[PDB]
Write a protein that binds this ligand. Structure first.
Ligand code: HEM
Ligand code: HEM
Ligand SMILES: [Zn+2]
Ligand SMILES: [Zn+2]
Ligand SMILES: [Zn+2]
Lengths: 106, 106
């Protein structure tokens, strides 16, 4: 998947998490988000097309996913434990990260 | 990249880290390692080449990388602060997460 498709995946699954009945659905949705975030980390977003691979901006971008994958992983543990609404709230607070990178780079 | 190439990148940077001259270099290598761990996440190891991508084995396999990227992440911050030494000792203990996975799965 390219970046836009990976982002849609992060989007489709946050939606699923909000409305899931049970832990297993939340946990799965979260696995799917982890994979997409991971697959997207190597992308070059259109706004940063003209900076070098090793530029502070590109490194910042990559670090944005390291945060995101970190919180996703944590949300995965809560859901894996059976804690549905804590997991759903962990998915909601992830949005800070989505937003802080869209402000800079989308 | 394929899994061999990613593991090569992991091993390689650890040796760049073991003998780095400044914090910048430790940070750069740790970052390269995070990206190679990100990319490897979705590989299927030869040990599980017959297993479904959603088997319990493959799940536990992907967890190993989630854990490893977390620890790389924290090591990256010690590097970034400029605590070169502590970062070098941090990277050395990552080998636990390397061997732990290798022993189950390589
Ligand atoms: C789970 C949290 C996130 C959600 C729900 C999300 C959602 C989205 C959506 C819906 C789009 C529109 C793309 C399309 O039309 O298919 C998009 C674009 C984009 N996102 Fe995210 N995102 C998240 C996290 C992030 C993070 C952490 C970063 C950066 C580190 C990021 C970087 C970008 C960029 C650069 C674009 C523009 C892509 C392009 O035009 O090629 N996103 N995102
Ligand atoms: C910094 C930590 C790690 C280092 C330095 C490392 C290094 C290596 C090396 C040198 C190899 C031999 C393959 C080659 O010749 O390149 C290898 C293979 C392998 N590693 Fe790692 N590894 C690390 C962590 C992990 C983790 C966390 C996992 C799984 C969660 C993993 C899974 C595997 C597998 C499945 C192979 C066999 C692939 C093959 O050679 O066909 N490794 N790794
Ligand atoms: Zn892809
Ligand atoms: Zn960080
Ligand atoms: Zn974990």
């Amino acid at each position: 998947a390219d970046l836009e498709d990976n982002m849609e995946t992060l989007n489709d699954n946050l939606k699923v998490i909000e409305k899931a009945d049970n832990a297993a659905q939340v946990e799965k949705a979260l696995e799917k988000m982890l994979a997409a975030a991971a697959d997207a980390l190597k992308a070059t977003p259109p706004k940063l097309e003209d900076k070098s691979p090793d530029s502070p901006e590109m490194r910042d971008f990559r670090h944005g996913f390291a945060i995101l994958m970190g919180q996703i992983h944590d949300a995965a543990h809560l859901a894996n434990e059976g804690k549905v609404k804590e997991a759903q709230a962990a998915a909601e607070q992830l949005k800070t990260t989505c937003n802080a990178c869209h402000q800079k780079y989308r």
